[PDB]
Amino acid sequence: ASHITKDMLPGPYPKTPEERAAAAKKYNMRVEDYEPYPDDGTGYGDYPKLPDRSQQERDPWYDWDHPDLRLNWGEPMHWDLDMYIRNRVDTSPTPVNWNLMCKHLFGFVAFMLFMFWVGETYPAYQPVGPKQYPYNNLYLE
């Protein structure tokens, strides 16, 4: 049961060097890119002075990580930044966006113009005159 520095207070400009770290060592001497200034967007009750958010992100992927536990399995001491989206989210790929996936289905979007026609096997084209005439001509005889 710890009462001194239990959590944050209404910040984030309450002499920020006193916060990290009295406890909650988010910053070393309030210049660590994680000094508890980051109340991004005041007026929201979410994330006060808060040894917490908009810190660098996107994914402790639990790779080699040989200091010790380091990442996600083995539990280092004080490194929780924002979680519950990060035990299932990873890093950067090869290339970049070039959204060819919508362009991949665009090939049949052009072939939706081939959905307008038919596929009759006999005969071929003969597309220039009225000799084709899909249905029958005269009556019995």
Binding site: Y122, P123, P130, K131, Y133, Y135, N136, N137, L140
Partner: protein
């Protein structure tokens, strides 16, 4: 090519036909062509798209499948003859665009 109209009974599933529904029928040569027995076609448990032509030859063909039970071929040449019933039926139908391309031209 057959038919007549005003089906007496209101029985759907087009067995209510003139006699027998063809694919198109008849149409010219011959302008008529007949069929099997509808009282036997319903007596034989047989689905639609099998009440077309060459059915009576097939009703005698597939009978030998059970009439020769532990067999590998009831009649393989008749299968080539039922196909010859089928191919002569189908090339009779293939002469549409031989005519319809020409009969739709001026005269």
């Amino acid at each position: 090519a057959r038919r007549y109209l005003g089906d007496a009974s209101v029985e759907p599933d087009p067995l209510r036909m003139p006699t027998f529904p063809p694919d198109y029928g008849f149409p010219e040569r011959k302008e008529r062509e007949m069929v099997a027995t509808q009282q036997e076609m319903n007596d034989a448990q047989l689905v639609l798209q099998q009440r077309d032509y060459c059915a009576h030859y097939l009703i005698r063909f597939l009978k030998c499948k059970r009439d020769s039970f532990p067999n590998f071929l009831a009649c393989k040449h008749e299968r080539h003859d039922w196909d010859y019933c089928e191919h002569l039926d189908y090339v009779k139908r293939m002469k549409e665009f031989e005519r319809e391309r020409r009969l739709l031209q001026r005269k």
